Amino acid sequence: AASKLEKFTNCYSLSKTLRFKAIPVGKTQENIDNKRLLVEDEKRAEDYKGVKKLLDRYYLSFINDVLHSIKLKNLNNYISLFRKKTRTEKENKELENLEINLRKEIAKAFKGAAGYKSLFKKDIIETILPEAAKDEIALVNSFNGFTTAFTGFFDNRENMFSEEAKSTSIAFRCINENLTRYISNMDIFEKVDAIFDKHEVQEIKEKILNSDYDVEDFFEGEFFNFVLTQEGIDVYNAIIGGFVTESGEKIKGLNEYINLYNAKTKQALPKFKPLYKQVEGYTSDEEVLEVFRNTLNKNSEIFSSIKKLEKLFKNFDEYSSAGIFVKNGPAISTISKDIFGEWNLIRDKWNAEYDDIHLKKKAVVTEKYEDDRRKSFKKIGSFSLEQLQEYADADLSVVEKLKEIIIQKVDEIYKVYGSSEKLFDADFVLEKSLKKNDAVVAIMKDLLDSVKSFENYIKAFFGEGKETNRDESFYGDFVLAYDILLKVDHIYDAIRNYVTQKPYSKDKFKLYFQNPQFMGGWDKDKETDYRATILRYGSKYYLAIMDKKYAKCLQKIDKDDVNGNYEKINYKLLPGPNKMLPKVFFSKKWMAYYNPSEDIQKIYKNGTFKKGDMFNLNDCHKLIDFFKDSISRYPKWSNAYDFNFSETEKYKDIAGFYREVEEQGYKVSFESASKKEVDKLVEEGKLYMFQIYNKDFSDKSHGTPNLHTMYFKLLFDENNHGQIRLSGGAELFMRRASLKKEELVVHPANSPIANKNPDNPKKTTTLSYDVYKDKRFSEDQYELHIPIAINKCPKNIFKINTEVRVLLKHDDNPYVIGIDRGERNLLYIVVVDGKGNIVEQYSLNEIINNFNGIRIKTDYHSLLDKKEKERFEARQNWTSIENIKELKAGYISQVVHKICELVEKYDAVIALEDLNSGFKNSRVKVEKQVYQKFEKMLIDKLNYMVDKKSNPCATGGALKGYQITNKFESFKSMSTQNGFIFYIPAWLTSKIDPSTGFVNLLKTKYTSIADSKKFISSFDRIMYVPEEDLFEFALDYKNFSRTDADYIKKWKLYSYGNRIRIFAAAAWEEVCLTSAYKELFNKYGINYQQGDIRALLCEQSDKAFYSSFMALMSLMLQMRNSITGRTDVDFLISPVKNSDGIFYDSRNYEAQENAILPKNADANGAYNIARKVLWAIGQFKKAEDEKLDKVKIAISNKEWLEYAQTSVK
RNA sequence: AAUUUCUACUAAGUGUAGAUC
Ligand SMILES: [Mg+2]
Ligand SMILES: [Mg+2]
């Protein structure tokens, strides 16, 4: 009988690496320099990039051994089934499986033969690179035994040969890029054949381009395989584009000839598309500038492609609107906005057309119907200009409005060129430095942006076809030009990364000290081989590295008593008992030293001790006892570890025994070694010594330590059985300094420094010593990464999701933490009990820190506000944008802690937005990409949640962290449920009356006067109430469309309260309700004491009554009201009364402590996100224990409104 | 404006609060 969290400790193992600074002690650094130990590791760091290029060389020769040798069998059917003019009906589906097998055939041809094995293993730079193609053999030699360097590279490069359908894959480049273009050129070649003079075709082209083959050949389908390799690609593209001839001659390609057939001026005869060949900036101001000048000046090719695209689109009318497509996705919203004037128009017209087909007059639109229709829209690949014009009202030519938009964008590039013109002068020199030159950086960004946006907008004109009749006459010119234009993407990114860079560098290189096996392990004596160990003196820890000539130097050292002793590390990790107990104890040396029995041998060889229905408990137990006894009689192990074994009988399986061996097969304590003696070893350079350090080891550190500091100390604390452990794979790095100390910004001693937190009541600080910006980057820095194992031997095994459900099922009053992102609040929190009562509500705009019993807050929302003003003053430059992103990422590391306390405090489950059902809205300040990061870190922390201020052995302290979450997988996997975390859709959580569950499901925009009458008439009643001085609209959501989700159906709307209206004016004004009705009715001669006035109201003859009656109605249903300037109120008022008679205003809760209902609209959202989890909990309470794992949690809008409206009481 | 590293700091004077492969 305890808390639900109590059950979640020692569940699964987790591994982490702690980093530290390593401070060289004494003469160590001098010795390191004299003996020149470092430079070995530093040049390798230099030539790493060089060797990588040589690896790419052999890779490219390889790719071209497999590609010369390949004949695609799948191909010949594929081409046919491709240009079959589809005819669809999923007959094409047959083909889309033929496609995948084209990539399948390529991948397997790589893997299948001519080696491929020896490619990403140690033997590629050992021997293979040396035998392939002196100044290059030398660099590779030379990395022998240091093959570690290329592992990240090795992973990045094996993705080349997959069937992955990624732009990484060679196969994808072959079939889904080159082959569609190769096919599309056949059909161009067939159509455009006779244009070619015999003297033009094979004459100049066959001889000068080849003298082998003929031009006809490369437009035959069986010839494609020839064009997989780069030569055949160059040959092909030279046929199209042209060729230099090796003399000045310059042979025209096919495209020039088609061009020269402008003589018929009908023209618009399609040109061929070239084939994709396959397989920046950033180091200096002079480089960055050289690229900008070179790629973006007015006779660059990017600027050439812009002029061609200007010419192309100027003739947009000349082309067939039926054969021009716009890719489906964001480009559809945008172009809808630019063409018609609204986002959802295209989507809306398309929904109007889908309905008519799928909407049976039995009707009632349901959630699934809307989900399925949505799945259909998304699935649609693209829209022709013709189809878009099909939605085009009269008066509005879609092509022409598009022309004026595109042309406009090119004119904006040309004006921006004019403003940047001096930058492209041969004469131009950079006076200041780039990161000191805001003006230049802004000139560059302006131009880059205007071209990037042009590029990014024009990209929409494909539709990934895979499409029927395309206007190849348009897509010839377009594709020629756009492939060039696209180069701006790379340039943009590189230049931006360079400006955005920190003024310092974190570049570093791994240290082996001329030792391939340096520091592989710790725990055991292999210390003569690994040559690194760990020393302790008082509170300080040290890393000690023995010189090769003196490995044993640490061996022989007295226990002293001259009053000076480092403590010295030893003892032992027994690694993987399950592999290692049988490898030792069945080794013939042991099978001599011991007998053993043949009953034991037979059990092992057959494996009657494992699982898998050959299991025999007694056979298993015999093995155990054999091992147990073998353990008594094996010195190496029984003088190392203190084995305390469970009775053999209470072992159910063999893993039970193995865990105990693993658990006890690790010791760790300390030896004793003369301080004076090793200190001298350092002096003589027999030993190199570094202090392992972070600021928490400073003699002036008095605060609560870093979490990782605790982990590290706890490694060697008596109270740690239980358990954090030290692991091998430690690495030492060198980080060369990147700032010069004399050049740092400094706050000089004895002068007040302004304090920056406006909520810090102390205004200045005066210290008696100097404070330096970024000081740590002005010194060469050694850094030490040490791997640790947490909960290596878990006792509690179970499924975390199932256990959470079971405990919630049997919890009589489970609390839920709701988190929501808000408009006036970065994050807002609502804690709720098992019945929906709010227990705690507040904004997380302010993070309050504790040190002593002193509290100081930081308002991160004001920070973001000052930085957004900064971004405005700086004209949205890159660096402010990065500053805002990082601020937010900082903020979320603060929030993670606030959530952990709340979980611990209320034993509560967490309710979070599912971001894969993504909506989002411009007003919320934490965007999706930051929130996703937040949700990942929340998960990461809940793998091992720890409160730093708890005593470490206590549950929830550093040796007993809560594990209430499984390991992160991906963002797509952040849905449904991860342990204590539940992912909820935000649908209908903010705009809903938390006291009745009323949500506005009507559509109140004026459309027509008939529609308005129908609307008014669909109401049950409209009656002015004299007693309560109110108008009462009584409705039945049945008589209105798309209201299926509502549960109560019958709702009496009233007037009381007022509302804030946009009133887009000469954009804010406010409006009292029940007095706006009185006004309007008087205005039109309608006496309203006469109710039911529905019939009456419909007697009105002009739009003006109706247009303003509807606008009035919309406001009554507008529950959320906000001024935007004033932080005071973003309130919620509801047009419907509860069972006790008065209705809900937010301002009546707006100032209290933790009210019973939400205080503003931000709260309501976090409150309702939490209630959906209560709903989910409610489903658990309905299921049997063994069914819990199966219960669905994806609440539907209909379940939600039923719950919101019935549970309130 | 100090950091294993990050963000926000100065937090009582070479650092503070979270977080951190
Ligand atoms: Mg600290
Ligand atoms: Mg900083």
PDB file of C-alpha atoms in Angstrom, chain A residues 46 66 105 177 192-193 207 238 251 325 351 511 522 525 587 590 629 800 834 891 1054 1061 1080 1149 1184 1194 1197:
ATOM      1  CA  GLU A  46      43.898  17.142 -40.293  1.00  0.00           C
ATOM      2  CA  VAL A  66      28.631  -2.797 -60.606  1.00  0.00           C
ATOM      3  CA  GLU A 105      17.598  -5.279 -58.420  1.00  0.00           C
ATOM      4  CA  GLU A 177      14.872  10.354 -61.347  1.00  0.00           C
ATOM      5  CA  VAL A 192      10.228  15.263 -82.704  1.00  0.00           C
ATOM      6  CA  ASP A 193      12.230  12.765 -84.867  1.00  0.00           C
ATOM      7  CA  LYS A 207      31.336  10.960 -84.993  1.00  0.00           C
ATOM      8  CA  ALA A 238      26.174  15.759 -74.408  1.00  0.00           C
ATOM      9  CA  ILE A 251      29.018  20.596 -81.695  1.00  0.00           C
ATOM     10  CA  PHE A 325       0.372  20.665 -62.347  1.00  0.00           C
ATOM     11  CA  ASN A 351     -14.667  19.106 -50.303  1.00  0.00           C
ATOM     12  CA  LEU A 511      43.841  11.249 -28.015  1.00  0.00           C
ATOM     13  CA  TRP A 522      39.336   0.455 -16.458  1.00  0.00           C
ATOM     14  CA  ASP A 525      44.180  -5.138 -14.588  1.00  0.00           C
ATOM     15  CA  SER A 587      37.637 -24.825 -21.901  1.00  0.00           C
ATOM     16  CA  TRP A 590      39.047 -26.242 -16.806  1.00  0.00           C
ATOM     17  CA  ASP A 629      30.933 -24.924  -7.548  1.00  0.00           C
ATOM     18  CA  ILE A 800       5.524  -0.090 -18.195  1.00  0.00           C
ATOM     19  CA  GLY A 834      -9.845  11.969 -10.417  1.00  0.00           C
ATOM     20  CA  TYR A 891      13.428  27.515 -21.158  1.00  0.00           C
ATOM     21  CA  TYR A1054     -28.834  33.661 -23.840  1.00  0.00           C
ATOM     22  CA  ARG A1061     -15.025  42.214 -31.257  1.00  0.00           C
ATOM     23  CA  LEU A1080     -30.850  46.317 -34.093  1.00  0.00           C
ATOM     24  CA  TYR A1149     -12.081  33.258 -11.473  1.00  0.00           C
ATOM     25  CA  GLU A1184     -10.826  -6.409 -16.999  1.00  0.00           C
ATOM     26  CA  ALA A1194      -7.886   7.777 -28.969  1.00  0.00           C
ATOM     27  CA  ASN A1197     -14.932  14.277 -30.629  1.00  0.00           C
TER      28      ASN A1197
END
